[PDB]
């Protein structure tokens, strides 16, 4: 479980957009620095830049 430190606007069809303060769960973080995440806040799923979030 992670919290967004910045807003992030999707740059690909596979990305997850989010706002600062959103809480996210990692679905898969085994493929690189982009993690597949699910927003606990919005219910959406997609890739996020791992340096935009912090553990909670």
């Amino acid at each position: 479980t992670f919290v967004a430190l910045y807003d992030y606007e999707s740059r690909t069809e596979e990305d997850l957009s989010f706002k600062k303060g959103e809480r996210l769960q990692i679905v898969n973080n085994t493929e690189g620095d982009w993690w597949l995440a699910h927003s606990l806040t919005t219910g959406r799923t997609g890739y996020i830049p791992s340096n935009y979030v912090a553990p909670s």
Binding site: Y6, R11, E31, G32, D33, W34, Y47, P49, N51, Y52
Partner: peptide, 10 residues
């Protein structure tokens, strides 16, 4: 905001 990481490679 931080620079974005490179996209994942296969």
């Amino acid at each position: 905001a931080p620079p974005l990481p490179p996209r994942n490679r296969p």
